Write a protein that binds this ligand. Sequence first.
Ligand SMILES: [Cl-]
Ligand SMILES: [Cl-]
Ligand SMILES: [Mg+2]
Ligand SMILES: [Mg+2]
Ligand SMILES: [Mg+2]
Ligand SMILES: [Zn+2]
Ligand SMILES: [Zn+2]
Ligand SMILES: [Zn+2]
Lengths: 597, 594, 594
Amino acid sequence: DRATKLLTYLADVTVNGHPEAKDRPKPLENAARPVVPYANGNGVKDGTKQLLDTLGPKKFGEWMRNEKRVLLTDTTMRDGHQSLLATRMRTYDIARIAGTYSHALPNLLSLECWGGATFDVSMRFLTEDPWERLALIREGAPNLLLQMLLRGANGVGYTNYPDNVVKYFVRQAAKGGIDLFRVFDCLNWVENMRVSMDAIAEENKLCEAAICYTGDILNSARPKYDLKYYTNLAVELEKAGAHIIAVKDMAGLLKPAAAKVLFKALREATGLPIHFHTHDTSGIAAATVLAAVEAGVDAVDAAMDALSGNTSQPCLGSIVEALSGSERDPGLDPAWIRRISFYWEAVRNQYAAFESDLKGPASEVYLHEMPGGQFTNLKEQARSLGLETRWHQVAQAYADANQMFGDIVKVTPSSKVVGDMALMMVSQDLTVADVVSPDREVSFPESVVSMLKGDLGQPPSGWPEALQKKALKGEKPYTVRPGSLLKEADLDAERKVIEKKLEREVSDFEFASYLMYPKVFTDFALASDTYGPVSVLPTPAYFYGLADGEELFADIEKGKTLVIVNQAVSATDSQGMVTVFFELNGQPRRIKVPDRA
Amino acid sequence: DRATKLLTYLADVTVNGHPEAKDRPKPLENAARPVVPYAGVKDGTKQLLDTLGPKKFGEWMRNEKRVLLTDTTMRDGHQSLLATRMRTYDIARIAGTYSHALPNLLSLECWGGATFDVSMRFLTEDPWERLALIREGAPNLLLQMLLRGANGVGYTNYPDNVVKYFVRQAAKGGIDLFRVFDCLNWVENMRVSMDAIAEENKLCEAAICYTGDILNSARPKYDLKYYTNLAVELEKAGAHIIAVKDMAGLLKPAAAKVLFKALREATGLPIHFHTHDTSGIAAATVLAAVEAGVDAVDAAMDALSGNTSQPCLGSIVEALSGSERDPGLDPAWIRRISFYWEAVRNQYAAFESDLKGPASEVYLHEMPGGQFTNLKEQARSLGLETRWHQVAQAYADANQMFGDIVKVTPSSKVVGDMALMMVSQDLTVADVVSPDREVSFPESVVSMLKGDLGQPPSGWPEALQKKALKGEKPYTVRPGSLLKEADLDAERKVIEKKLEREVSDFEFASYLMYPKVFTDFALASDTYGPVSVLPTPAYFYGLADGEELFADIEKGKTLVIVNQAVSATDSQGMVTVFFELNGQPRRIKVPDRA
Amino acid sequence: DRATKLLTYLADVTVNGHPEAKDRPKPLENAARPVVPYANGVKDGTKQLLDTLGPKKFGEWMRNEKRVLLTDTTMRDGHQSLLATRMRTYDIARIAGTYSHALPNLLSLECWGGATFDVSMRFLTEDPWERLALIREGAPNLLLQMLLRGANGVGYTNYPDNVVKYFVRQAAKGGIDLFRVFDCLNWVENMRVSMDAIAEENKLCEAAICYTGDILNSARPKYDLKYYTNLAVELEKAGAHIIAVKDMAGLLKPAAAKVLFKALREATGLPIHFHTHDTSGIAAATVLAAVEAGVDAVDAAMDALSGNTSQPCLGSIVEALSGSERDPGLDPAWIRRISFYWEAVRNQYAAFESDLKGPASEVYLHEMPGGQFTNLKEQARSLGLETRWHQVAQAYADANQMFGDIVKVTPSSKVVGDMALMMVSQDLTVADVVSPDREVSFPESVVSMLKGDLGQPPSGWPEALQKKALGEKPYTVRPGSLLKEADLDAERKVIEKKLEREVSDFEFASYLMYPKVFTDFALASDTYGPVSVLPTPAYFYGLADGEELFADIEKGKTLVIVNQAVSATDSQGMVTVFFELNGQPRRIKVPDRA
Ligand SMILES: [Cl-]
Ligand SMILES: [Cl-]
Ligand SMILES: [Mg+2]
Ligand SMILES: [Mg+2]
Ligand SMILES: [Mg+2]
Ligand SMILES: [Zn+2]
Ligand SMILES: [Zn+2]
Ligand SMILES: [Zn+2]
């Protein structure tokens, strides 16, 4: 019966394709399966997880500060495929390598493996549960910290939520295995970060409060985001309970000369340790990372080679190689880094359907300031509206829209708003002058109206009045924390709603999912009752089913491995159904599914 | 009739396609054509060189505080990312834009390397015409080439007189700055080339090729002294500029700060840095080299940058913008030109590799940037795509077997040939050098160990040697000393009778270097004509039904050509294509080669 | 210019196929062009006798002639019955001259009238008069014979007297020598006019008696022997030169032939002429019984268009007679050569073949005319009925008795057809069609006949029927006496306006008969030219790529047309066809009708 459901999934995808893969490039036919590397046999060295359990978060930050070596965080399991493969990487490929990280790289600070877009995408597009994913990683890497990206008041969503929801979600994330919460607000508004940061601390976990980087601190024609802006924020966040401060350079804008100045000043403005995250869209972020290291930063993020570069993080193997033998040599075996990269390479070849057409570095990023994680999504959202051929007009409009909003931090979800505005400006051939024209009726996107009303918070100098008065068409804006206006979610009543929808009790984790993504979670749970635990399928089978005659090994459970053979597939019948003829462990099964064509 | 020959090309490729493109990826359909940006030109380095001469121009470079930039898009850039298939049409069309928009540039690397060969062999076009057109579009910038020293633009050592005659014509054809290197860094084998460039009163930039890791004490053959010594011996040889040629992108940042400081202390000549970005961090190295006072550096336009190419020009410039050493180049024009190169590049989709980004592995195999892609594909030909990571191990093993050597063109091609033989034939290094296993080497390897590409500082490993040349005596003198000085008077007669028409000195120089490729190119050019004036989508795929094509035969005549219809194949085997040339109809028969 | 119009047509059909052929079967790809037999080297014939003797005196000569006289129907009923009348002027006229030299003892060629008039214009884009003219030139020694539908002429409904008067007049100056005139219900008063118009044109009037039922069946006395001997008598006094028995459905059995023709000869002095169809598969017996009983003339089709719904086999009937007292004296080898020509001609018309396999005694149950049988089957395909065809044959017989047991022949047969088809489609019985409480909605064909428009049976239309089918009070008077005498100076103005031209009288006769069809035809002639001159493959499928074609625009002017290429469809929806016309290139545009 879990078998019957998996067979039903295999049949269906075998018969009808997968919607996400059906009209997109296919991997190569021969395709080496990814192979988990033989680990020698050495048992697992205590690492940062054991320390954190011993010291607690405050003393752990202090240990970070004091540590001479630079500490490394791998983003391959989260930001890496978010930025290069539309976040489509599956639990099957992610979980299987965790053990290897654990044995072979016991000195990593952490694995970035959760939050950001993975929460949503995992259910909506992958038909899998992000909590299963987290538990599997936890169990694979019990010596390393596991790290999520949490969007402050926007949780793992796109809009500000009631405080009690944000609090509950953080309670479940803790219980579920997150040790290190990198938490950020899209407008760098500390007031809108206080709820999350306190909730992370109440769970006695690491609150790594981020400052999003934008602009250029070494260009005095843009004083709004100068050195003081950043150092003052680090102080404000220390006062607010951070254990760690991050610099989240979401679009890869920090340049090397600026990192030398920025990190030296930061580490003079707070005693807290500093963690630097960047993207390699410019083709020079490895330089920026090395300068950060030379200037005393405590930790840096990087991605495995095979999922590094471009809009992803810069190359982990190559940064380690450059540091090797230096004073702050981080102590990681490069041969193992390259072996895990080789697994990642083979993994990634399976996701050909989700490759973008991005060819390499672009200094254009200094102009548009599109976060790495948005770049691709937005390019497609433009392809979508027939603007493929004017991508460079969209990047210019994005820069113009940014200035029109008064020069703001653009990261989820504020980047989406600037993205909508840019797309509209181009579709409709409107300049910013046109947009704010008294004489010119403009249908602003809902998200722009909503940002200008106050729903995403407050940029440090408020929203420009003229654009605002015109966007709002008379509705009054507000400048209070958006969560202070939201009715407190009635948790007991909400639980009952979804429990009736599903005719069963749900877990607290699942409720946290419902609270964040009610429709998406509902759809996923209903899909799960039909198809069973399809996350256990290897990736080609999940996206393409089984070829004629093909044999598949699946582990429904720890004992039980299902051997499944596709023996034949019928023509479509009068009732519009197709019958797939499987052998399950040498026994014949006929599974009927619809012809969805 | 210059038209008739062209139509014959457009009919032939329309019906049959182009062999280099028939079974590789097509571009998108709509395909934005590349647009030359809308714009007198400021004197730059060209005029300066003309004023000062090479020696004093090298000095002007040293004294110069700003870092000088060399753009490699027109040569290494597509060599490294597109098997060098970039066409004159797209290259010449942007030269003027460079000339007016980036007049501070030091130079354009736009010639030599694999372009001489590939231009004719795979693109049906004259590399000299390409040079002349670039000279005409960019009369204010230095044109730079890569010279393979005793190898010229080919894959083996030539007689001196053939080397001298070639350098004679390159300068006459418009080269100002010759980056010359020897593939095993043997100075005696450069002397001939560097003297010849001096004699034309052009800039000799003599390159020391980088390899290994100067900050790792367990590989000492390539220490710092080894670079500084070579610098000094090259100054003494009459260099105007010294280049560090990091052909595989091996120089790490910490290293660059030590190397460059020391080079500038060792010699007073300016220093020029070339590297590739296979590692993903070469921009860090380039910036460190600048902070250490390097006088000039190479980069490629964003759109043909990264991975096996040079690192990103726009971003490097941006990282420098406002600093003491700011190169003073307009980022908005950098971007405009990059957007052109991106549009251009989409037209070469057939030639992309499947390389997805940085690889720290380059520190293991030391494969040069502009080999990597090619050798990956030579392994898929020998059917070894499954075992690519074992090929790379062989290259590293082989390298060591050969005594640990500089792997650059053509020595790199030879470690390549040894590497792939060992994957296929399932062979170790201990089994490579073993007495009981008979093991036929590739010609290339036979050649190199007899001494045909010169001598590594140690000389070749004795046992590897006494097994490879099946008995024959190897030589340790300089290949050109033994090679007889070809009668240029005589070798000229043989090419002219083969063509039944007198050739130019430029053409003859293309004979000396590449007799059969040039010959094959020349007979193609009496059949098909000046194909190089055809836009690139037309060159590779012909004209679609209904389609309309503007072509400039000279600059005077513009031909307007419309493919109006195409018949089925007849009994005589021939297909007729119906054109409109400036409103008057034409029929062209072409064979069906299916 | 006429060349241009032809080019236009050839392009249009090459690009878009022909609506009559696109989704029907295609002849074999190799296809032997039909070949006109070379006649060894004209004896005057039956045409010269009629010019000499006059018609009354000519019927005498027929009568007294011992040998049986033969009429070949290959040109008319033959392809009307087997190929939906699609046979083209090009193929018909080409063989006339061969008949003329090879079979000079023939009585006549049935080559005009029937469905040819309609179909030549509507489906073949050609003039029936040009057709007649061409046959007249080719065979100035045989009588040309047409089928005239009395009051209906060449139409499907009764026309005004002066129109009929008119049409006959034109049909005579056009070359018809022998008119076989018949009324679809055998009503003589309604032949009156037609016959008085033929007589006044000093041509032959072969008044036809339609055969139905079975004279030797005591069970169905309505059509007994006196029914036919009295109709002869009456028709002689009406001025006939020849008495014809037209057995349109092939119902006359051989025993019935001995009796009918011995008796017909006793009743009138006029010579007799027998036409029958071979649906039963025994009609050749009926024709031979008829000969042995002294019938003066009989119809047969060339072997290759004989059998089934056509006439029986000319060659075999002649072979049957050869050497007997009534031997018709036709060379059998020439019959065969002409048949082989028609067999090649036939294969070009594959698209119009029925799937009729052969003999069917069912014809005695349903009495469908040879000519109808196939159309009515396609028509039952048209309405969804191939699965129940034998129920439709039962309906048709049942409807016949319902109308009171009548003569079924164009146009009365179309009427029974429509009725039968309805009766099935609605699962309606004879009882239900008739009963008081049952709202049947009758076809336009059914009301019109039972209102009087196609005339009167001997007994009248059944009372009950007419009352229900009608409200409109009926008419037992002769239709043409109620229809008004149309002013044909006025109507002539009408057509000459729409076509903005002086038309000839031939063409005016076509207008009067088929106003919309003639009009659509003339407009199309304007667009496309004399498409009738094209050979048949080309008319129906145009020209393959590279195919070379010869067409005789005038008689002294051959054109040479090559189709050399066909472009893809342009943004305007147009396709350009690239011709060579007499070595000079031509480009023709036509719509992509897809
Ligand atoms: Cl939702
Ligand atoms: Cl050659
Ligand atoms: Mg520290
Ligand atoms: Mg300098
Ligand atoms: Mg007689
Ligand atoms: Zn990120
Ligand atoms: Zn290079
Ligand atoms: Zn008939």
